[PDB]
From Swiss-Prot, chain A:
The keyword Chaperone does not apply. It comes from Homo sapiens (Human). It is found in: Nucleus; Chromosome. Residues 131-165 form a coiled coil. Changing residue 140 to R: No change in sumoylation. The modification Phosphoserine is found at residue 53. Belongs to the XRCC4-XLF family. XRCC4 subfamily. GO terms for molecular function: DNA binding; enzyme binding; FHA domain binding; identical protein binding. The chain holds residues 1 to 168 of 336 of the full protein. Changing residue 26 to E: Abolished interaction with NHEJ1/XLF. GO terms for cellular component: cytosol; DNA ligase IV complex; DNA-dependent protein kinase-DNA ligase 4 complex; nonhomologous end joining complex; nucleoplasm; nucleus; site of double-strand break. This is DNA repair protein XRCC4. Residues 1-168 are annotated as: Interaction with IFFO1.
From Swiss-Prot, chain B:
Changing residue 9 to G: In IMD124; likely pathogenic; fails to translocate to the nucleus; decreased ability to repair double-strand breaks (DSBs); impaired ability to participate in V(D)J recombination. The chain holds residues 49 to 148 of 299 of the full protein. This is Non-homologous end-joining factor 1. It is found in: Nucleus; Chromosome. The gene is NHEJ1. The lineage of its organism: Eukaryota, Metazoa, Chordata, Craniata, Vertebrata. GO terms for biological process: B cell differentiation; central nervous system development; double-strand break repair via nonhomologous end joining; immunoglobulin V(D)J recombination; positive regulation of ligase activity; response to ionizing radiation; T cell differentiation; telomere maintenance.
Amino acid sequence: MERKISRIHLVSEPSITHFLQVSWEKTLESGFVITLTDGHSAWTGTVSESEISQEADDMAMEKGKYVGELRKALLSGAGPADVYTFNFSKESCYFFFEKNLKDVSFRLGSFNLEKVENPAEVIRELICYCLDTIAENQAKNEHLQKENERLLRDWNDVQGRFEKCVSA
Amino acid sequence: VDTSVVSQRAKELNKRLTAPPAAFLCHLDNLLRPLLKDAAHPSEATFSCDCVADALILRVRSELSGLPFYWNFHCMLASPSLVSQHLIRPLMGMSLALQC
């Protein structure tokens, strides 16, 4: 099970950062669960494989590149030469993301979200995941730092002995 | 073709594209001019032709930023004056110049 959190600036209110989390089972192809949270009230929704396939077919492009574009869009994988635009309407509960290009936008995709009735739980879960991840990464970093210190000491010692070996 | 027809056709074919006519024509020029000026260019632009009683549909499929871009030319048989002024008279002038 995989999850990715990204920051976004909705064009409707371009002054507050909203946080979008995408959770998928084994790959982005199978489907995913999208949760968009603004810190007070959040919206959640589910997208199945069938919707992705239909969107790809209508878009008139191969599935691989459509999945690549989705990954580069939602999963913060954008490179330098690409600017995207996300849109959300709360009154209609509609979400859609497009790709801007020199005054030419392309409606890459569109989902529908249904509000969650207790934002506290989802906010708490997201913060919990973030804290757990930082803890685990810190553990790994400290471990490999210790390993490198040990190995460097070993290398110093062995080369020091090699000098004498060659001299003799 | 003028601007309104371009905008209508662009909305129809490219359902998910939303651009002003000026930008669309600029992109079409950037897509076509490289091929017309010189071949063997490393650009993705496939062409096809259909036929009807009189008309010809020239279909252009390409990609910009890797995303699809379709256009169709609905060409009707050219008027006698246009064919004359563009082929018959210039070719006669060319022949006379080469003879000189």
